[PDB]
Amino acid sequence: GGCSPHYILNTRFRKPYNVESYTPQTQGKYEFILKEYESYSDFERNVTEK
Amino acid sequence: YGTHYLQSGSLGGEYRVLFYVDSEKLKQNDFNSVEEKKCKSSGWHKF
């Protein structure tokens, strides 16, 4: 039977008998992580004898 | 079904941002230089 009104936006849906709820609980979570590392090492040595 | 039901409330939307930047830069030059000379000349007055 059913035929209770269920809507999402302007569209209307027939809920199956088995379903207690299907509901547009709408959420969004975003995560950005960026890790840049640099190291450099330089060693010049000179030795001169005359 | 949880512990409570909603007796009253408000509906709408929530938005949040946390944003974080951290830069460190290091540049380092250590230059040392030793230059040494010794020289000598000798002779009686012949040599």
Beta bridge partners of A8: A11
Residue pair A15/A4 in contact (Cβ under 8 Å)? The answer is yes
Breaks after residues in chain B, judged by C–N over 2.5 Å: 45
Resolution number, Å: 3.3
Question: What is d(CA A30, CA B18) in angstroms, rounded to the nearest whole number?
Answer: 11
Who's near A16: CB < 8 A, 6+ residues apart? A2
Q: Which residues pair with A7 in a beta bridge?
A: A12
User: In whole angstroms, what is the distance from residue B14 CA to residue A27 CA?
Assistant: 9
